[PDB]
Amino acid sequence: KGKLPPVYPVTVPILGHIIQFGKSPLGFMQECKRQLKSGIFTINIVGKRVTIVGDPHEHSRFFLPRNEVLSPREVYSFMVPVFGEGVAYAAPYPRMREQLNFLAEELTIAKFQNFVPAIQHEVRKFMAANWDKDEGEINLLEDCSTMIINTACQCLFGEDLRKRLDARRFAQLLAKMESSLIPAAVFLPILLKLPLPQSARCHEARTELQKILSEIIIARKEEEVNKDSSTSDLLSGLLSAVYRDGTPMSLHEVCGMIVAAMFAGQHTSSITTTWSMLHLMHPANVKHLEALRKEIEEFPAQLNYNNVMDEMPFAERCARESIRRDPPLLMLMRKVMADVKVGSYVVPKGDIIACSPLLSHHDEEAFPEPRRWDPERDEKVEGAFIGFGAGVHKCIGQKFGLLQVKTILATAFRSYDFQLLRDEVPDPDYHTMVVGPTASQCRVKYIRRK
Ligand X SMILES: CO[C@](c1ccc(Cl)cc1)(c1ccc2c(c1)c(-c1c(F)cccc1F)cc(=O)n2C)c1cncn1C
**Distance linking the first and last C-alpha atoms of the chain:** 66
- Rounded to a whole number of angstroms, the minimum distance from the CB of residue 296 to ligand X is 27
- Contact between 118 and ligand X (CB under 6 A)? no
- Of 321, 318, 246, 265, the C-alpha closest to 107 is 265
Chain residue at closest Cβ approach to ligand HEM = 397
Binding to ligand HEM, residues 92-111 (CB under 6 A): 100, 103, 107
Say how far residue 101 (Cα) sits from the centre of its chain: 18
Interaction with ligand HEM in 175-214: which residues (CB under 6 A)? none
To ligand X, the closest distance from the beta carbon of 334 in angstroms equals 11
Binding of residue 264 to ligand X (CB under 6 A): yes
Phi, psi dihedral angles at 139 (to 5 degrees): -95, 115
255 has binding-site annotation: no
Per CB under 8 A, the list member of 90, 100, 138, 182 interacting with a copy of itself is 182
Q: Closer CB to a copy of itself, residue 192 or residue 395?
A: 192
Tell me if 303 contacts ligand X by CB under 6 A: no
Are 312 and 410 spatial neighbours (Cβ–Cβ below 8 Å)?
A: yes
Q: Kindly tell me which of 426 and 436 has the beta carbon lying closer to ligand X.
A: 436
Considering only 80, 161, 261, 354, the residue that binds ligand HEM (CB under 6 A) is 261
The piece of 62-70, 117-125, 243-251, 358-366 that touches a copy of itself (CB under 8 A) is 117-125
Residues 302-341 that bind a copy of itself (CB under 8 A): 302, 304-306, 310
Using the rule CB under 6 A, is 390 a contact of ligand X? no
Q: What is the CA radius of gyration of the chain?
A: 22
Shortest Cβ distance from residue 448 to ligand HEM (Å)? 28
Candidates 238-246, 297-305, 326-334, 346-354 — which segment interacts with ligand HEM by CB under 6 A? 326-334
Closest approach of Cβ 227 to ligand HEM, in Å?
28
d(CA 327, CA 317): 14
Q: Which does 263 bind (CB under 5 to 8 A by kind): ligand HEM, a copy of itself, ligand X, none?
A: ligand X
Query: Of ligand HEM, a copy of itself, ligand X, none, which one sits near residue 400, judging by CB under 5 to 8 A according to partner kind?
Result: ligand HEM
CB of 445 to ligand HEM, least distance (A): 26
- Asked whether residue 430 is marked as a ligand-binding residue, the answer is no
For ligand X, give the closer residue by CB, 83 or 418.
83
Whole-number minimum distance, CB 140 to ligand X, in Å?
Answer: 20
The answer to whether 393 is annotated as binding is: yes
Q: What is the 3-state secondary structure (H, E, C) of the chain?
A: CCECCCECCCCCCCCECHHHHHHCHHHHHHHHHHHHCCCEEEEEECCEEEEEECCHHHHHHHHCCCCCCEECCCCCHHHHHHHCCCCHHHCCHHHHHHHHHHHHCCCCHHHHHHHHHHHHHHHHHHHHHHCCCCEEEEEHHHHHHHHHHHHHHHHHCCHHHHHHCCHHHHHHHHHHHHHCCCHHHHCCHHHHCCCCHHHHHHHHHHHHHHHHHHHHHHHHHHHHCCCCCCCCCHHHHHHCCECCCCCECCHHHHHHHHHHHHHHHHHHHHHHHHHHHHHHHCHHHHHHHHHHHHHHCCCCCCCCHHHHHHCCHHHHHHHHHHHHHCCCCCCEEEEECCCEEECCEEECCCCEEEECHHHHCCCCCCCCCCCCCCCCCCCCCCCCCCCCCCHHHCCCCHHHHHHHHHHHHHHHHHHEEEEECCCCCCCEECCCCCCEECHHHCEEEEEECC
* Min CB(401)–ligand X separation in Å: 8
Candidate ranges 110-118, 145-153, 218-226, 408-416; the one touching a copy of itself (CB under 8 A): 110-118
Span from 213-221, 238-246, 394-402, 436-444 in contact with ligand HEM (CB under 6 A): 394-402
Question: What residues from 340 to 369 belong to the interface with a copy of itself (CB under 8 A)?
Answer: 344, 348, 350-351
Residue type, 97: R
Our CB check for ligand X shows the closer of 86 and 117 to be 86
Q: How far apart are CA 13 and CA 47, in angstroms?
A: 8
Residue 263 is a binding residue for ligand X (CB under 6 A): yes
> Which residues within the stretch 188-217 sit at the binding site for ligand X (CB under 6 A)?
none
Please state, as a whole number, how many other Cβ atoms lie within 10 Å of the Cβ of residue 358.
22
Contact segment (CB under 6 A) with ligand X among 33-41, 220-228, 325-333, 339-347 equals 325-333
Nearer to ligand HEM, 107 or 352 (CB): 107
- Residues of each annotated binding site for heme b: 76, 89, 97, 334, 393, 395
Q: Which residues are near ligand HEM by CB under 6 A?
A: 72, 100, 103, 107, 260-261, 264-265, 268-269, 272, 323, 328-329, 332, 387-389, 393, 395-398, 400-401
